[PDB]
Amino acid sequence: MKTPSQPRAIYYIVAIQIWEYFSFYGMRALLILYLTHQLGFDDNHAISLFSAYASLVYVTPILGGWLADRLLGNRTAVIAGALLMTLGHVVLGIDTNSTFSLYLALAIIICGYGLFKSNISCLLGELYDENDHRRDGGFSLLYAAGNIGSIAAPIACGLAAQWYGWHVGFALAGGGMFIGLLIFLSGHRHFQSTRSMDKKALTSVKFALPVWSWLVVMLCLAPVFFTLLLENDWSGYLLAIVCLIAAQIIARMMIKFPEHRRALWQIVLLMFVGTLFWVLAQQGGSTISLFIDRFVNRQAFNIEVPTALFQSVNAIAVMLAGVVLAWLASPESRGNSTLRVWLKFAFGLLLMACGFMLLAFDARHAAADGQASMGVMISGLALMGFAELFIDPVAIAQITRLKMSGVLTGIYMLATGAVANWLAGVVAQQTTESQISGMAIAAYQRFFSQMGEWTLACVAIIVVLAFATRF
Numbered sequence: 118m119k120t121p122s123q124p125r126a127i128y129y130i131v132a133i134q135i136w137e138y139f140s141f142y143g144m145r146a147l148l149i150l151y152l153t154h155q156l157g158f159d160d161n162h163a164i165s166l167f168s169a170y171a172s173l174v175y176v177t178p179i180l181g182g183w184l185a186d187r188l189l190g191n192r193t194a195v196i197a198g199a200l201l202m203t204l205g206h207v208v209l210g211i212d213t214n215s216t217f218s219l220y221l222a223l224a225i226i227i228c229g230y231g232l233f234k235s236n237i238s239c240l241l242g243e244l245y246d247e248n249d250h251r252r253d254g255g256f257s258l259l260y261a262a263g264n265i266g267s268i269a270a271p272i273a274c275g276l277a278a279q280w281y282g283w284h285v286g287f288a289l290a291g292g293g294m295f296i297g298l299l300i301f302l303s304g305h306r307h308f309q310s311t312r313s314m315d316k317k318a319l320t321s322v323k324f325a326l327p328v329w330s331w332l333v334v335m336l337c338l339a340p341v342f343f344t345l346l347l348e349n350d351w352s353g354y355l356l357a358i359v360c361l362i363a364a365q366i367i368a369r370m371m372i373k374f375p376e377h378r379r380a381l382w383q384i385v386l387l388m389f390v391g392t393l394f395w396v397l398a399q400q401g402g403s404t405i406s407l408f409i410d411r412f413v414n415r416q417a418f419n420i421e422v423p424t425a426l427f428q429s430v431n432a433i434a435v436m437l438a439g440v441v442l443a444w445l446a447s448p449e450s451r452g453n454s455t456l457r458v459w460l461k462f463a464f465g466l467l468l469m470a471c472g473f474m475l476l477a478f479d480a481r482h483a484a485a486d487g488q489a490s491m492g493v494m495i496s497g498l499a500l501m502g503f504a505e506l507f508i509d510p511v512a513i514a515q516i517t518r519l520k521m522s523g524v525l526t527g528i529y530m531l532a533t534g535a536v537a538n539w540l541a542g543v544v545a546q547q548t549t550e551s552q553i554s555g556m557a558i559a560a561y562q563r564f565f566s567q568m569g570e571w572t573l574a575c576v577a578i579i580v581v582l583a584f585a586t587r588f
Contacts, residue, residue, distance in 0.1 A: 120250065120251070121251070123251055123254065123255065123258075124244045124245070124307075125307050126244055126307035126308055127241070127244065127255055127258065128304075129300060129301050129303070129304030129307065129308075130237065130240060130241050130301070131258055131262045132262075132297060132300040132301065133195070133199065133297040133298065133300065133301040134237060134259055134262040134263055134266070135262045135263075135265055135266040135297065136266065136293045136294055136296055136298075137199065137233060137237070137266070137294060137297055138263045138265075138266025138267050138270070139266040139269060139270040139273075139290070139293040139294070140202060140206060140270070140290040140291065140293045140294035140297075141174075141202075141226075141230065141270075142266060142267045142270040142271060142432075143270035143271060143273065143274035143286070143289070143293065144206065144209075144226070144274070144287065145171075145402060145428070146270065146271035146274055146275060146402075146406075146425040146428040146429075147274055147275070147278055147283060147286050147287065147290075147425055148167055148170070149163055149164070149167045149402065149403055149406055150406065150410060150425065151213075152219075153407070153410075154283075155213055155214075155283055156216060156219070159549070159552065160407065160548065160549040160552075160556065161546055161549050161552070164403050164542050164545045164546065164549075165350055165542055165546075166223075166347060166350075167402070167403055168399075168403070168538050168539055168541055168542025168543075168545070169346075169347055169350060169539070169542070170223050170227065170347065171399070171538040171542075172356060172534070172535040172538040172539045173227045173343065173346070173347075173352055173355075173535075174226075174227055174230045174231075174234075175530070175531060175534030175535040175538065176231075176355065176356070176359060176531070176534075176535050177227055177228065177230060177231025177232075178230070178231050178233075178234040178235045179235070179527065179531070180231055181194060181198065181231035181232040181233070181234070181235060181236060182235035182236065182239070184232070185232070185235070185236040185239065187315075187318070188314065188315055188318055188319060188328065188332070189314055189315075190311070190312040190313055190314045190315070191236040191237075191239045191240040191243060191311065191312065192240055192308055192311050192313075193314050194232045194233070194236040195232070195233055195236050195237055195240055195301070196301070196302070197229070197232050198228075198229040198230065198232030198233030198234075198236070199229065199233060199294060199297065199298040199301070200229070200298070201225055201228050201229025201232065202225075202226050202229035202233065202291075203229075203291055203294045203295045204225055204229075205221075205222045205223070205224075205225030205226035205228075205229060205291075206222070206226070206287055206288070206290050206291025206294060207288075207291050208221060208222040208225060209222035209223075209287045209291075210284050210285075210287040210288040210291060211284075213282075213284050213287075217344075220344045220347050220348045221340060221344050223343070223344075223347055224339075224340040224341075224342075224343035224344040224346075224347060225340050227343050228339050228340060228343065237259075238256070238259065240308075240311060241255055241256065241259055242256075243312065244310075244311075264432065264435070264436045264439075267429075267432040268429050268432040268433055268436065269429075270290070270293070270429075271425050271426055271427075271428040271429040272426050272429050273289060274286045274287075274289055274425060275423035275424070275425030275426045276423060276426075277289045278423065278425065279423045319332075352539070353539060356535055356536065359531065360532075360536065363528045363531060363532070366524065366528065367381070367528065370521070370524075370525075374521075377519060380518075380519065383455065383515070384512075384515065384516055384525060384529070387458075387462075387512045387515060387529075388529055388532050388533070390575070390579065391462070391508050391509065391512055391529070391532075391533050391537075392532050392533050392536055392540070393537075393575065394462075394465060394466060394469060394504075394508050394533075394537075395508075395533045395534075395537030395538075395541070396537050396540045396541045396544055397469050397473070397541075397568060397572060398469065398501060398504070398505060398537075398541075399538050399541030399542075400541060400544075400568065401428075401431055401498070402428065403541065403542070403545050404548050404561070404564060405476070405498070406424060406425075406427070406428070407548075408476070408480070408489075409424045409427050409494060410424040411558075412480065412483065412488055412489050412558045412561065413488060413489040413490075413491060413494055414486075414488035414489065414490065414491060422491075427494070427495070430495055430499060430502070431498050431499075431501065432502070433499075433502070434498065434499040434500075434501070434502025434503055435502045435503075435506065438502065438503045438506050439506060442506060453587075456583055456587065458511050458515055459579060459583040460580075460583065461507045461511045462507060462508060462511065462579060463576050463579045463580050463583070464507055465504040465505070465506075465507030466504070466575055466576045466579070467504075467572075467573075467576050468500050468501070468503055468504035468507075469500075469501055469572050470569050470572035470573045470576060471500050472496075472497040472498070472499075472500040472501035472504065473497070473501075473565050473566075473568040473569040473572060474565075474569045475493050475494075475496050475497035475500065476493075476494060476497045476561075476565040477562055477565035477566040477569055478493065479493035479494055479497070480558055480561050480565060483558060484558075489558070509533070512529060512533075513526060513529070547564060547567070548564045
């Protein structure tokens, strides 16, 4: 007999997954351009704020996962997260001229994203029995939904912003999130099997107060906390605490499972190298977006392409590459697995190097005309997108060889997200040592040349050690 179909609720989860990824990746395409053009931030300040936001959105999902586990259930937390992200995009759209509006909106979005990101996948995993064969198709479709939304959002938001200004771009992102929420809520009759909210826990009293009122207080104060954390650039102290906690978890883990201790060190070393990779990769939305805005010739068809659209190019490059390797998946995946892993990382770093070399070459030879060339930059972005398939999938495939691999996966994603984004913001300050003179193309040319050189240095070190340890 034919296999049973996917549980119909999947298609509503997919729908919200698209629209959330639409909103999140739309705002991300506009943000640094809005900070510079509308608000008149110096590049140092804009890059700092951007990287702080990009780290906190990788930090808060742990807290929202613990909240959905202990109190809310996954469905409630998904709904609340979508409401909060909608509210924050509406706040950002309604007033484009206060800066406090910006910080408040970003804090509200960070909270809603923290409630959403983990719990949407937990809710998808709740629909299947423990040995259901459909689960892999489910999660693959959810990943495809996220890729679709990541490709689609920078185009639509960029065009809407160009034609009507930043207000309508952010309003469009929020309307996307709201559409997705209404689609999800219309499917409620299919979710009746999923875990409801723990009414007994919420009606438990802790100190003088019922727990639900502590959630009300938290809903009020957490946006204030994150607003102050962003406005003062204090996110680094939180990131340091998170890193210290993760290090303690790993150390206790090293004691508890000494028969796997050396394997754990391999994962640690992977966490290091992948973090450095993502530092480079996170130049994509910050320094490279400013370079494209300022110094690339974007004229075509007697039209000018909005810089935000080039953020979609990366996503296309990732998705296409994902297909091709899937088209070419082959039984040669055997033998010295650790050496193969390290050579995959070396190849990804090499592709990242080539991307930065193409950007540096373009920014140098622009001097023949005065502006850089769209095709060489596009090629760099494409190569940088392709590089991403050889890092995180190989790392998670290596981690998932162990038990306890969910916590190590969480720690790996926390490092390569939050730490890599904060370090990317720190590194990007090297583009802006020449504040007094004004920005010039030579500063980006130096930055890209240095990034290429360091990438090839890391490639050489990895390859040399990996082969020297074979003999």
